[PDB]
From a paper:
The activity of [name]/2 is inhibited by the Cys-loop, and we find that substrate interaction relieves autoinhibition to activate these DUBs. We also find that [name]/2 use a non-canonical catalytic triad composed of Cys-His-Thr.
The crystal structure of MINDY1C137A:K48-Ub2 complex reveals how MINDY1cat has extensive interactions with both the proximal Ub (Ubprox) and distal Ub (Ubdist) to precisely position the scissile bond across the catalytic site. Ubdist binds to the S1 site in [name] with a buried surface area of only ∼750 Å2, a binding interface much smaller than those of other DUBs such as HAUSP/USP7 (1,700 Å2), USP21 (1,700 Å2), or USP2 (1,900 Å2), which rely more on Ubdist binding for activity (Hu et al., 2002; Renatus et al., 2006; Ye et al., 2011). The I44 patch on Ubdist primarily contacts I266 on [name], and further interactions with Ubdist are mediated by V210, W240, Y258, and F315, which form a binding pocket for L73 of Ubdist. The I44 patch of Ubprox mainly contacts F339 on [name]. The binding of Ubprox at the S1′ site is further supported by additional cation-π interactions between Ubprox F45 and [name] R316, hydrogen bonds between the side chains of N317 and Ubprox N60 and the backbone of Y59, and ionic interactions between Ubprox R42 and [name] D336. The only significant change is in the Cys loop that undergoes significant remodeling, during which several hydrogen bonds are broken, accompanied by the formation of new bonds.
Author numbering:
A (entry chain A): 108 to 369
B (entry chain H): 1 to 71
C (entry chain D): 1 to 76
The structure:
């Protein structure tokens, strides 16, 4: 709760069984909680009944054991060095999961990130990583200036453009700067529409939005985010938050995706 | 700039704010409207707690955004 | 000498440095005035990201020169 590597465990009635989800009190462990809450909801990791407090060390130990036990998709007597590489690069990034994980979104697709060691952790676990920071094709200004650029490319392109002689570039600069400013919460209406359609019914996934990672699922063609803030630790019937607009105006739902009241 | 604060009781508070306003300022403004002390207020946006010492701008909170207020 | 650092927010930090200072050293100084982690910080000057081990002198960063600070997107 108070000390910086301690989390409150919240038990919820998930699909017939008391199931733990880990809550967050301070910024930093959202990537670790997003993964660990998926492993707990799939019963791939189990906690002693009514454990109340868990540490970073315990979560990392469980996650490490899960990663090291993944087998390659194709079974071979030899080689599989590419798979072994993914695992070692996943083990090196593991500790950053408690303190904060770097991502580089591209604005072209809900699954589009620069492939980096950080991405590997989700890939090896078969966990989809999504984002809804999508440039609207009906803003062809933004589509032309933003292009196939990642976030990291685009903030540099903005700096170059501001110092350009070429008025075509100065203008590209302004449109991109204006994209980043109006979509600063990192979710567009187009992203939300594309994400709702691409996500798989019943599948658990990680969602990056506003410098935060959430556990996400899709039920009855609708997106939901797991509620992890410790402020809801005592609210058994507050489990899932609807994701159906970009301004945070959500409905709380119980374990079974039924509206909850207080 | 106008934002909304939804409690669990189902009540919606409207506030007038600036992006440069601190979370501490926003809690003061909630005390004005509902007389709830800042120290009993926890603000949350898009699932992440908004902490004291940072601004609305720091958390990319734009006009017509909804925050959640809990004990 | 005194250099300037422009964030995308618009505010500007002033630093005292020597041409002999490493980029790591300037990221460290930035972690004070603004509290930001060095591994989140990216420094741009005349079209290049500055590498940690290089010196200000290596990139001909003179007195009154302006650097650009852009952050990595970090989820917490």
């Amino acid at each position: 709760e108070m000390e910086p590597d301690f989390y409150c465990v919240k038990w919820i009635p998930w699909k017939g069984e008391q199931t733990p989800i880990i809550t967050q009190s301070t910024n930093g462990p959202a990537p670790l909680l997003a993964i660990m809450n998926i492993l707990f909801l799939q019963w791939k990791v189990k906690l002693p009944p009514q454990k109340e407090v868990i540490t970073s060390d315990e979560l990392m130990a469980h996650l490490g054991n899960c990663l090291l036990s993944i087998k390659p998709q194709e079974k071979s007597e030899g080689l599989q060095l590419n798979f072994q590489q993914n695992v070692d690069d996943a083990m090196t990034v593991l500790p950053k999961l408690a303190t904060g994980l770097d991502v580089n979104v591209r604005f072209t697709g809900v699954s589009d990130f620069e492939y980096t060691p950080e991405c590997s952790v989700f890939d090896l676990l078969g966990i989809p990583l999504y984002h809804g920071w999508l440039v609207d094709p009906q803003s062809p200004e933004a589509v032309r200036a933003v292009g196939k650029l990642s976030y990291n490319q685009l903030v540099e392109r903005i700096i170059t453009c501001k110092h350009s002689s070429d008025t075509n570039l100065v203008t590209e600069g302004l449109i991109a700067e204006q994209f980043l400013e109006t979509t600063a919460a990192q979710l567009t209406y187009h992203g939300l529409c594309e994400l709702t359609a691409a996500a798989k019914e019943g599948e658990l996934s990680v969602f990056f939005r506003n410098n935060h990672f959430s556990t996400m699922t899709k039920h009855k063609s609708h997106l939901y985010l797991l509620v992890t803030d410790q402020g809801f630790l005592q609210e058994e019937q507050v489990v899932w938050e609807s994701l159906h607009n970009v301004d945070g105006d959500s409905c709380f739902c119980d374990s079974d995706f039924h509206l909850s009241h207080s | 700039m106008q934002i909304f604060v939804k409690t669990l009781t189902g009540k919606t508070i409207t506030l007038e704010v600036e992006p440069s306003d601190t979370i501490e300022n926003v809690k003061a403004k909630i005390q004005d409207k509902e007389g709830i002390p800042p120290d009993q207020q926890r603000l949350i946006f898009a699932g992440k707690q908004l902490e004291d010492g940072r601004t609305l701008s720091d958390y990319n909170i734009q006009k017509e955004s909804t925050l959640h207020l809990v004990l």
